[PDB]
């Protein structure tokens, strides 16, 4: 859909209104996800200078090598 409102409840976009704050893409598991990771979240964060990074609240053993931060 749009950045302000999306077509899925489990996906949220935090859009920066100025150049002094970061941008975020947040996704909470559920539906067909495993029960163990049912309510965990995975996010992509973009710094104001344009640097992207990945983070997640899932357990370490489930983390892929790209998001092990």
């Amino acid at each position: 859909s749009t950045a302000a409102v999306t077509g899925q409840t489990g996906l949220t976009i935090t859009y920066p209104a100025s150049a002094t704050e970061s941008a975020a893409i947040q996704g909470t598991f559920g539906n067909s996800a495993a029960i163990k990771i049912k309510n965990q979240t995975l996010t992509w964060t973009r710094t104001p200078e344009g640097a992207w990074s990945c983070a997640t609240t899932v357990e370490a053993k489930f983390k892929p090598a790209g998001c092990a931060s």
């Binding site: 067909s32 495993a34 029960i35």
Partner: protein, 70 residues
């Protein structure tokens, strides 16, 4: 030939007095083993449900009735 008949009677008594080696330990064990198989076959279902996030009602079991209630 009375002694021969008495020897026959003694042999019959000896044969009738054989010791039964407590067969109950075998049958029951096998039965338990069978259950250990059947319920085990359900595991591959339940995991596939749990890893899918389905509820108890939505998890379909391919279970068939067993002559042992277990």
């Amino acid at each position: 030939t009375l002694i021969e008949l008495m020897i026959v009677v003694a042999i019959i008594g000896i044969l009738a007095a054989i010791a039964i080696p407590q067969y109950q330990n075998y049958i029951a064990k096998s039965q338990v083993s069978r259950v250990m198989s059947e319920t085990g076959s359900l595991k591959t279902v339940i995991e596939t449900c749990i890893l899918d996030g389905k509820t108890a009602a939505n998890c379909e079991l391919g279970w068939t009735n067993s002559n042992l209630l277990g």
